Amino acid sequence: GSSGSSGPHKCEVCGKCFSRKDKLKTHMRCHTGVKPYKCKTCDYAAADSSSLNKHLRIHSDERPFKCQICPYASRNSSQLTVHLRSHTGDSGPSSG
Ligand SMILES: [Zn+2]
Ligand SMILES: [Zn+2]
Ligand SMILES: [Zn+2]
Structure with missing residues (x-):
């Protein structure tokens, strides 16, 4: 059976x-x-990715660093170092 739910919607x-x-x-x-x-x-909001990619151009941002797992980016290497930590279960290659 079902009782139902309702309420205010702002x-x-x-x-x-x-x-x-x-x-x-x-x-x-x-x-x-x-x-x-x-x-x-x-x-x-853009329909085609590129559209958004170009829009970011106008925005002056120096992000030479780029993570591998995620497309994330950082202005400094240090920041990236701490960021990586996030990737705990990085399933990849491993010998030994
Ligand atoms: Zn509205
Ligand atoms: Zn913008
Ligand atoms: Zn990452």
């Missing part, structure tokens, strides 16, 4: 309180952007 996305489900249901119409390509700081 447009946290922007911060608009909506009690009438009918209202919100449509309110979303505005927030319609399911693009996995979004800036790090800006709220811009």
